[PDB]
Design an enzyme around this catalytic site. Structure first.
Site, PDB file in Angstrom:
ATOM      1  CG  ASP A 175      -2.113   0.931   1.062  1.00 34.29           C
ATOM      2  OD1 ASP A 175      -2.217   1.605   0.008  1.00 34.29           O
ATOM      3  OD2 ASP A 175      -2.962   0.979   1.978  1.00 34.29           O
ATOM      4  N   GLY A 228       0.956   3.830   2.110  1.00 30.41           N
ATOM      5  CA  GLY A 228       1.289   4.389   3.409  1.00 30.41           C
ATOM      6  C   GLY A 228       0.368   5.491   3.903  1.00 30.41           C
ATOM      7  N   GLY A 229      -0.188   6.262   2.975  1.00 31.58           N
ATOM      8  CA  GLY A 229      -1.074   7.351   3.347  1.00 31.58           C
ATOM      9  C   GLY A 229      -2.148   6.991   4.361  1.00 31.58           C
ATOM     10  CE1 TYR A 230      -8.004   3.791   5.972  1.00 32.25           C
ATOM     11  CE2 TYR A 230      -6.641   2.006   6.831  1.00 32.25           C
ATOM     12  CZ  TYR A 230      -7.859   2.664   6.766  1.00 32.25           C
ATOM     13  OH  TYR A 230      -8.926   2.195   7.498  1.00 32.25           O
ATOM     14  CG  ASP A 244      -5.063   6.942  -1.707  1.00 33.22           C
ATOM     15  OD1 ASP A 244      -4.128   6.621  -0.944  1.00 33.22           O
ATOM     16  OD2 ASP A 244      -6.160   6.346  -1.705  1.00 33.22           O
ATOM     17  CG  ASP A 282      -6.118  -5.482   1.852  1.00 37.73           C
ATOM     18  OD1 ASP A 282      -6.587  -4.725   0.980  1.00 37.73           O
ATOM     19  OD2 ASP A 282      -5.887  -5.101   3.018  1.00 37.73           O
ATOM     20  CB  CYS A 286     -11.483 -26.200   7.629  1.00 43.66           C
ATOM     21  SG  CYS A 286      -9.860 -25.434   7.428  1.00 43.66           S
ATOM     22  CB  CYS A 335      -6.329 -25.557   7.464  1.00 45.67           C
ATOM     23  SG  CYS A 335      -6.577 -25.424   9.264  1.00 45.67           S
ATOM     24  CB  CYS A 338      -9.185 -28.321  10.650  1.00 44.95           C
ATOM     25  SG  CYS A 338      -9.869 -26.718  11.114  1.00 44.95           S
ATOM     26  CG  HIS A 390      -8.996 -22.335  11.140  1.00 46.43           C
ATOM     27  ND1 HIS A 390      -9.580 -23.314  10.365  1.00 46.43           N
ATOM     28  CD2 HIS A 390      -9.989 -21.472  11.463  1.00 46.43           C
ATOM     29  CE1 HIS A 390     -10.865 -23.049  10.215  1.00 46.43           C
ATOM     30  NE2 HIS A 390     -11.138 -21.936  10.870  1.00 46.43           N
TER      31      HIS A 390
END
Ligand SMILES: Nc1ccc2nc(N)nc(O)c2c1
Ligand SMILES: Nc1ccc2nc(N)nc(O)c2c1
Ligand SMILES: [Zn+2]
Ligand SMILES: [Zn+2]
Lengths: 364, 364
Positions: free
Chosen positions: A92, A94-96, A144, A268, A299, A301, A304, A330
């Protein structure tokens, strides 16, 4: 592979499924990107992140520029080498985070003090792009100015307008750096709050400049799912159809399903909450102390397959690190399984049905 | 495999190397046992613990009896099933921790309040053995009364005497429980502080009762390496030669080497400290911020094959969980590599030389 190639293999309504080919690997869309804060996906080795099915992870310009530093990471060989993840990485701008964790704003950029050492930094479109280059980012996000919710029409317009000016500066900075322009991709970010005319103006300005992908920014900032979905309804169609659509910071399972139904290709998003096809559960609850069943009944994974809710319940209430490791693997695995089911259903023209079945059970 | 079979394959001076065969697996000696506090080896999946080379791990009666509870673990199927470790597990008796973390003492046992909920518990030889059975422990430790350092001859004798009485009660409790006596092993614990006559009395009483193994307790409680080595010099020879010798709570690399030189076969012991053949280093130190080398130059662990000191330095200073995961895997792997070199050198009759070379470099 090419620098960047997005190809859509199947469609159903506004939903799409396909692939983004990049030098470091292929990304299957719709895609969910685990988030790496301080050059690490919380409590997971990169191999484990990959094992869950992730094709790409997200890095942050803000956190990394503060610690361990962009210049340092570059000297060390780049973020990929540093953390041990050799597949694509989206960073990203960085602004956020600066407006949420650290500030003097102007048309040139933003100056702020680190919430760590208290030092100062002047993030600008040019510096943001440079830092992402130093990190060795594969998908660079334009710098932005996010718009807080709610926002008045006037303020939303001013911020959107500045963002488009900054989007142009981001594009030029990116293209001027030969190595970056030839090996990485650049995504522009649509702003405009919840206002249609502004979203349209933002989309047009972005398409005029030209980007490898388009993100829908400014959402998931407190407006609620109904409002978000309403904004997506008219916002996504405004973006170029042949490029990826990235909804920043959206991750609740139902939000993802609804967003894909509206044209989104990338997601994300960042305790005892464990996701299950029957809705989330909080493993800390006493009713799980002697529950021998796995976190989720289907699941596949590793967590599990090997440990019970009773054990993870114990680990989390005991504050043990393995508790976090198992819960995180998980949950990320659950998300990847969700994206896989979405991709398969779209490919087989039964996504609408999948969405219906998913919601029925998830909220039952 | 048999319930228990200790066989010595090679010797050099007082040092021995061999194997302990048990139903759940074989233990190579000298052995180092990673410690599991709350039914977990801090920040490591059991498979990772096994990958480093550990043949057996240690569990604690104290921590487990408080959380999640001995009865609960039994109902859940035992500690092995609970945490996902199917190899041998040695459990301490709990007494040591009660006097350090939680107390009314008597000849019947000890009563105390949990440092968690504040509840009460009456640990006795009989209850200690029962709890280890409920956990499904493979090597059960007799319930004793540790002697604080320093200790007056009178107090050391009284505690040693009580421990031998408790050792007899532990033996009888163990043998009376058919399932436990036929599938697990019982180790007695020698006490007597730093006094030779008391150590001799303790060893004789223990041998008279008869145990599968003999631990040297009461050391590593603040007496220093010189004193500890002096006590081991005359204490270990007092124990039965054909059974394992276990030095409780001793783990510094140099301490282990010296202890093996004095007849010890088993060890156990519990941040930015990383072990290297050139001595320990603290990864938090600023001089490692841009050091691309692995924690140790020859260590073959996964951490040293994939990540640099610079990265781990970043992780630890950032308080990231992966930092702990990587540091712990390397350290436990280092210990196992140390035990392997010890076992190989004894088998090849060059242990004394190995000890000399080890110290020269480790303290250089
Ligand atoms: N909900 C979000 C999350 C992350 C964002 N990042 C940037 N750069 N801009 C936005 O509008 C975001 C919105
Ligand atoms: N240094 C130590 C560590 C653990 C011990 N555990 C028991 N039960 N007894 C001792 O004497 C110990 C000494
Ligand atoms: Zn799972
Ligand atoms: Zn290592």
């Amino acid at each position: 592979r090419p620098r960047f190639s997005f190809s859509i293999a199947a469609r159903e309504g506004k939903a799409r499924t396909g692939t983004i080919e990049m030098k470091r690997g292929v990304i299957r869309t719709p895609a969910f990107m685990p988030v790496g804060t301080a050059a690490t996906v919380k409590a997971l080795k990169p191999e484990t992140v990959r094992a869950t099915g992730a094709d790409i992870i997200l890095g942050n310009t803000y956190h990394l520029m503060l610690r361990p530093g962009a210049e340092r990471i570059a000297k060390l060989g780049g973020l990929h080498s540093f953390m041990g993840w050799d597949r694509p990485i989206l960073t990203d701008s960085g602004g956020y985070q600066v407006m949420s964790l650290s500030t003097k704003q102007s048309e040139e950029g933003v100056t702020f003090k680190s919430h760590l050492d208290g030092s100062r930094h002047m993030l600008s479109p040019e510096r943001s792009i440079e830092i992402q280059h130093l990190l060795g980012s594969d998908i660079v996000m334009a710098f932005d100015e996010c718009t807080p919710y709610p926002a008045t029409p006037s303020r939303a317009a001013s911020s959107m307008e500045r963002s488009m000016r900054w989007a142009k500066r981001s594009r030029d900075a990116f293209d001027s750096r030969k190595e970056q322009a030839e090996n990485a991709a650049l995504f522009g970010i649509q702003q405009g709050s919840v206002f249609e005319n502004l979203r349209q103006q933002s989309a047009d300005a972005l398409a005029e400049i030209g980007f490898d992908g388009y993100a829908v920014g400014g959402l998931a900032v407190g407006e609620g799912q109904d409002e978000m979905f309403r904004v997506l309804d008219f916002s996504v169609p405004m973006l170029p159809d042949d490029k990826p659509h990235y909804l920043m910071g959206v991750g609740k399972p139902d939000d993802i399903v609804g967003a894909v139904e509206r044209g989104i290709d990338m997601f994300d998003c960042v305790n005892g909450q464990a996701f299950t096809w029957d809705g989330p559960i909080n493993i800390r609850n006493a009713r799980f102390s002697e529950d021998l069943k796995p976190l989720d009944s289907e699941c596949h994974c590793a967590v599990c397959q090997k440990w019970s809710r009773a054990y993870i319940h114990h680990l989390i209430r005991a504050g043990e690190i393995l508790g976090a490791m198992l819960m995180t693997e998980h949950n990320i695995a659950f998300y990847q399984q969700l994206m896989q089911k979405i991709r398969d259903s779209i490919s087989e023209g039964r996504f609408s049905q999948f969405a219906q079945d998913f919601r029925a059970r998830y909220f039952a």
